[PDB]
């Protein structure tokens, strides 16, 4: 028998659903999302990392001109300076203080750290959902763990579970991702082969170990200071090492809907977004026939105290007479009141106690114990806490509706003004009637 | 949970007060001033003898 229902996508809140099968005693499932995971499909556009600039010993040609030979190295730059006269430690390197040249050349490469200090720029196409769920079935807890794609049925304790997909396909990731160790960022990174100096992507490579490098660091060689053998240059410093100081907050800290984020593989987790369909094909062996369960009568429901406190801040005692000993399901027919207990043991003429949670300032609600449907009301005190460390276990309130018993001033003014309007209309109608009957 | 009340300043007479907290059975406290002691702060001007 396939029951089907929608739970909110809120993780860590248990939800109660009523399996009211025709001609059988009613069955009640508690179910809780333990974690919902969205994992995007990742295509690597490129790695970025710190570059090393490679500068071999400058070739100082004494007594004549060297010349540049162009070569295909990643940001190769080369220059010939004329009229140098360099000194080593022991004396001048050249016979004459004129006609000499220095050929200075450089390029850039990946550092050898690019195997471990790199950020990966990814494209994040779309995300496969997964859910882990606890269900209270035949009075005991069981955990189910299934892809939330609306397929991939999972069987446990002879029930078959099919879960998702969610009402909202939202995800915290933009189409463009960058990740660095534990952190992932919604960065619109530059195209491969089109990154700019001193910014994220000033050096790029297709994979950490790829032989290729794109580099655009604006490396400019400069004329050496007189008397020395050095190679001075101007270059924009590593845009990766600047990005690491200027990142801002990872999605782990900034994402909407309270979600967590993790990065091996990359997942969003526990987003409070939309709602989730769930369906449960439970066996006929789970049910019991409507006459084999306790049948209840002469029921009365009393409410010792109520507070609308998010935490089952109200408690109710139900007095009853019941035909036989056994377990029996309990459910609430009013959406503004959630009861903690899914089932109870019942016998004789006695009483049962249930703990309940609500937003209502006067909790009027209808409770069902095996097809027997008692009514009660309560007057609720507000809590003293101001704020709490757990989400509301009650359903939210339609703020205009379900207003208090003892709001009846609304009926006193609507009735009283309604009578004054009705009297004035009746008087106008009778004087209209006689003055029309005079024509 | 804070409760506040005013008892008359009469020594040796026991006063009842009711802590009528929601969700709990109401708690009754009895209290009685055993003494009240107005010591003045007190500055010497002189001895006579």
UniProtKB/TrEMBL annotation, chain A:
Q: Which residues cross the membrane?
A: 417-437
Q: Give the UniProt subcellular location, in the record's own words.
A: Host Golgi apparatus, Host trans-Golgi network; Host cell membrane; Host cytoplasm; Host endoplasmic reticulum
Question: Domain of life here?
Answer: Viruses
**Disulfide bond sites:** 49-114, 62-94, 63-96, 259-271, 306-380, 328-370
Assembly state and interactors? Homodimer. Homomultimer. Interacts with host karyopherin KPNA4; this interaction allows the nuclear import of the viral capsid protein. Interacts with spike glycoprotein E2. Interacts with host IRAK1; the interaction leads to inhibition of IRAK1-dependent signaling.
The UniProt function text for this chain reads:
Provides the signal sequence for the translocation of the precursor of protein E3/E2 to the host endoplasmic reticulum. Furin-cleaved E3 remains associated with spike glycoprotein E1 and mediates pH protection of the latter during the transport via the secretory pathway. After virion release from the host cell, the assembly protein E3 is gradually released in the extracellular space. Acts as a viroporin that participates in virus glycoprotein processing and transport to the plasma membrane, cell permeabilization and budding of viral particles. Disrupts the calcium homeostasis of the cell, probably at the endoplasmic reticulum level. This leads to cytoplasmic calcium elevation. Because of its lipophilic properties, the 6K protein is postulated to influence the selection of lipids that interact with the transmembrane domains of the glycoproteins, which, in turn, affects the deformability of the bilayer required for the extreme curvature that occurs as budding proceeds.
Q: What is this protein called?
A: Structural polyprotein
**Organism for this UniProt entry:** Chikungunya virus
């Amino acid at each position: 028998y396939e029951h089907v229902t929608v739970i909110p996508n809120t993780v860590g809140v248990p939800y109660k659903t009523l399996v009211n099968r025709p001609g059988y005693s009613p069955m009640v499932l508690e179910m809780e999302l333990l974690s919902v995971t969205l994992e995007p499909t990742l295509s690597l556009d490129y790695i970025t990392c710190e570059y090393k600039t490679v500068i071999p010993s400058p070739y100082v040609k004494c007594c004549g001109t060297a010349e540049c030979k162009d070569k295909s190295l990643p940001d190769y730059s080369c220059k010939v300076f004329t009229g140098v006269y360099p000194f080593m430690w022991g004396g001048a390197y050249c016979f004459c203080d004129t006609e000499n040249t220095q050929l200075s050349e450089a390029h850039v490469e990946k550092s050898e750290s690019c195997k471990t200090e790199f950020a990966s720029a990814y494209r994040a196409h779309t995300a496969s959902a997964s859910a882990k769920l606890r269900v209270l079935y035949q009075g005991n807890n069981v955990t189910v763990s299934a892809y939330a794609n609306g397929d991939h049925a999972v069987t446990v304790k002879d029930a078959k579970f099919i879960v998702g997909p969610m009402s909202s396909a939202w995800t915290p990731f933009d189409n463009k991702i960058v990740v660095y160790k534990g952190d992932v960022y919604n960065m619109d990174y530059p195209p491969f082969g089109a990154g700019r100096p001193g910014q994220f992507g000033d050096i790029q490579s297709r994979t950490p170990e790829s032989e290729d490098v794109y580099a655009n660091t604006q490396l400019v060689l400069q004329r050496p200071s007189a008397g020395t053998v050095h190679v001075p240059y101007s270059q924009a410093p590593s845009g990766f090492k600047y990005w690491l100081k200027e990142r801002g907050a990872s999605l782990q800290h900034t994402a909407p809907f309270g979600c967590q984020i993790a990065t091996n593989p990359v997942r969003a987790m526990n987003c409070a977004v939309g709602n989730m369909p769930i369906s449960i094909d439970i066996p006929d062996a789970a049910f019991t026939r409507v006459v084999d369960a306790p049948s209840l009568t002469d029921m009365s429901c009393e409410v010792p105290a109520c507070t609308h406190s998010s935490d089952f801040g109200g408690v109710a005692i139900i007095k009853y007479a019941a035909s036989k000993k056994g377990k029996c399901a309990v459910h609430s027919m009013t959406n503004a009141v959630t009861i903690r207990e899914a089932e109870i043991e019942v016998e004789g003429n006695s009483q049962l106690q249930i703990s309940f949670s609500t937003a209502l300032a006067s909790a009027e609600f209808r409770v069902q114990v095996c097809s027997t449907q008692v009514h009660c009301a309560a007057e609720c005190h507000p809590p003293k806490d101001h704020i709490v460390n757990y989400p509301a276990s009650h359903t939210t309130l339609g703020v205009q509706d379900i207003s208090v018993t003892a709001m009846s001033w609304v009926q006193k003014i609507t009735g009283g003004v309604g009578l004054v309007v009705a009297v004035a209309a009746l008087i106008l109608i009778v004087v209209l009637c006689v003055s029309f009957s005079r024509h």
